[PDB]
Design a binder for this molecule. Structure first.
Ligand code: RUB
Ligand code: RUB
Ligand code: ZN
Ligand code: ZN
Ligand code: ZN
Lengths: 462, 461
């Protein structure tokens, strides 16, 4: 890679990972086209199974192939099935092989938690925008181990203030009772980050659709939620409780971040920021340790007003990491992603997917209640009415809910919550359903341990 | 062949009718060939090449490129092919003038002069909208299309009040431009009502707007004619009148019959002069005499002493219709086998300037669906038997004329078309959702002689 701070080996491993997962999804349609052409031939059911097993790595539903002759092979359902099975194998390998090398207990996960405490933060809770183009922001954009971070995605970065406050009490409680992540009377803070995005190449149409592609607006709402969380904590607990804040954006064309370096008490400005492109150039010609020393100087000078020193160290580390992602896009994507808009393979709805860390793989819509999250799901369906329905393909929806395995009943409740979402989806797009253009897979994840999600129902039935 | 038949004209018109009808009827056979090929590797390539050869255009690629999922969407291709065929048909009408009767054509200039000599400064014709009469002007009466206002209506029930308004507009143009002639000149506006009947099966193949009763269709057509005249005479001072002509046509043979009127439009409903008796009466005569005998026959069939120019003009229509009688004997055995409805698409809105062939278009006049949905429902039921019976969609072409001098009239017309489309999609949601009904939106600038313009479609990509 060109920049002396860039992790060339990591760019290689990351690039192979992205390429392999995308290829698995992209070979579905060529395989299914080939199958469609065989549906009148002699041993089609047998032939199809062996073809699918050999080129997709999993079989197809026997009763679909069996019943093709009545009307025709139901490719819409087969497409959904294959997307679902590919999601499922992808997901499995994530938990089993740790492609990002960031699982709990991994060297880089423990290391980042240690560095974080060294900067005076005992938990990094980041809300990116739920835009599928930001799904790699943690693992690729900031090169952080995914298990060292609380990732809480929302459309336009509008996280839930009340639930954040509660995550803070939980965190405080484990500090008091288990000294995890650290002792309770250590001088560390909860750090809440909001991460907006924008398009340098098409600043006006390809930005954050939840804020009308107005960069200034997405940054303002993002900061406004940060400030509310901070105020909520101070007003809700005795003895000067507080949190730290960080506002950031990322360019969906180049993956370069920009940061509004705050001053000690959270003071940040919306019109001033440090851009990673600018940092990258100021250091491109230096030895690593001198480049690193310049990043700190730049972050320090860029502070809205006198900043907290740990904040400088952490923020400097994020720029150092993003530099690798900047070279990544330059070295693998001509300096600008050809898929500037939405190109996602399936819609994910419910709780953020622990295991999705790839750009443009999943259009995510958060929803804890259906009658509360329909809007974002609607934006996602209309996106896919273009990506998929226009090609004759259905809209593959993957429902997710985490649960605490160590709580009796929790798994069954989450499974029953998956089903009310499915029931709600079926009511809401009744036409798309009827026609075979919308399908749902239900999944649940024991968040109490590092284990694969598990499928617990589907709109595909035999 | 009759001594008065224009042989070569009969060939040219036949060559035209068979050409356009071939274009439309080649569609199904092509789509049948494509359907057989949709599992082959090079399907898209082979289909495009078949369509170019056969229909002369290629197909929407999205529909071919995705046939492997749903299967090949024939209903939508068929509609799209009918629309594309209509566009090529229509564009070539204005480009090539197959009838040799556009504005400024020698034929049109000749006939405009002849109408003036007969004492008439405008010829306004309402045939029943029935698809079996769309060729009445160009084939049946051999008139240049542009020398004539054609105003079709179900059962020939034209708008009395709007016709008076057309008379007013005509006089005004005589006053201000002396076009077609000075206002003081002793000419009259001529309104014609053309009803039809079936000589082979009079009980069921007649004018369905009037229950296939010949008398009712004849008498309602006259009722409108009288009412128009009475309306002019009552609404303006001084002279203020119009001339009238009630005619029918047999849809089995294309013979006309004229109720020759007295000078003041005195028309008898029970007595007519049938072109078949004219035909037989003059068949053994050399042309010069045959023309004389047609004259004396029209003179003698008048209800009371006729106007001299009316006698001349009606004699010319008989002389002209005798060729069309020979036409149907030559190329249709003396009786069309498509005795009934065999139209290739529904047309709604204003009459189609460019449509002049028998059983090509089921036309439903309407300003809005809210009115004349009855007339549209009739067509839709018919195309359930013609197209939905065999799995094909019902193709609708909406047309509105607008004055391409009024600023924004084109815009107004386009929005009028979409207003109709919404109303149609609401009237037949079952067919529309099952993809068994599609609409093409066309507007035509009626201030000059250019082709209509396609402005939207239910087929969407
Ligand atoms: O970070 C999140 C939230 O969203 P995402 O899955 O996108 O990261 C997970 O809940 C982690 O497992 C937290 O760890 P724990 O549940 O043990 O506190
Ligand atoms: O009656 C007609 C033609 O009847 P049809 O359209 O049914 O053949 C009109 O005189 C003109 O054509 C209208 O406008 P324009 O002068 O532009 O043609
Ligand atoms: Zn087949
Ligand atoms: Zn966004
Ligand atoms: Zn009729």
């Amino acid at each position: 890679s060109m920049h002396p701070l860039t992790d060339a080996s990591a760019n290689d491993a990351l690039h192979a990972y992205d390429t392999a997962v995308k290829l698995a999804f992209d070979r579905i349609v060529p395989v299914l086209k080939r199958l469609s052409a065989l549906q009148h031939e002699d041993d089609f059911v047998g032939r199809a199974q062996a073809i699918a097993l050999e080129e997709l790595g999993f079989p197809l539903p026997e009763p679909i192939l069996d019943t093709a002759w009545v009307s025709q092979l139901d490719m819409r359902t087969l497409y959904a099935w294959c997307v679902f099975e590919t999601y499922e194998q992808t997901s499995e390998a994530f938990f089993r092989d740790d492609p990002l090398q960031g699982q709990p207990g991994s060297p880089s996960a423990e290391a980042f938690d240690r560095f974080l405490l060294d900067c005076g933060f005992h938990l990094l809770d980041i809300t990116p925008c739920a835009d599928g183009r930001l799904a790699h922001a943690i693992g690729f954009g900031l090169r952080l181990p995914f298990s060292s971070v609380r990732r809480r995605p929302h459309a336009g970065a509008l996280f839930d203030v009340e639930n954040t406050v509660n995550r803070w009490v939980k965190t405080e409680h484990r500090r008091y009772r288990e000294a995890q992540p650290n002792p309770a009377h250590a001088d560390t803070r909860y750090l809440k980050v909001a991460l907006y995005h924008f398009s340098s190449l098409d600043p006006q149409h390809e930005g954050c659709a939840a804020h009308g592609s107005d960069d200034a607006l997405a940054a303002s709402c993002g900061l406004s939620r940060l400030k509310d969380f901070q105020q909520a904590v101070e007003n809700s607990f005795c003895c000067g409780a507080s949190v730290d804040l960080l506002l950031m954006g990322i360019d969906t064309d180049t993956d370069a971040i920009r940061v509004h370096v705050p001053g000690m008490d959270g003071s940040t400005r919306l019109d001033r920021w440090l851009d990673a492109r600018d940092v990258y150039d100021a250091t491109l010609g230096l030895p690593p340790d001198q480049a690193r020393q310049r990043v700190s100087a730049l972050v320090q000078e860029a502070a809205a007003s006198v900043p907290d020193p740990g904040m400088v160290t952490l923020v400097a580390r994020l720029f150092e990491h993003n530099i690798s992602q900047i070279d990544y896009v330059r070295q693998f994507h001509g300096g600008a992603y050809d898929d500037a808009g939405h190109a996602e393979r399936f819609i994910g709805v419910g709780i953020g997917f622990k295991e999705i860390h790839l750009r443009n793989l999943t259009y995510f819509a958060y929803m804890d209640t259906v009658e509360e999250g329909a809007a974002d799901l609607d934006v996602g369906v209309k996106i896919f009415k273009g990506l998929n329905v226009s090609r004759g393909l259905p809209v593959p929806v993957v429902v997710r809910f985490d649960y605490h395995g160590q709580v009796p009943g929790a798994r069954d409740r989450a499974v029953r919550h998956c089903q009310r979402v499915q029931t709600a989806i079926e009511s809401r797009y009744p036409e798309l359903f009827q026609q075979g253009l919308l399908h749902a897979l239900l999944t649940v994840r024991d968040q109490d341990r590092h284990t694969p999600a598990e499928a617990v129902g589907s709109t595909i039935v035999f």
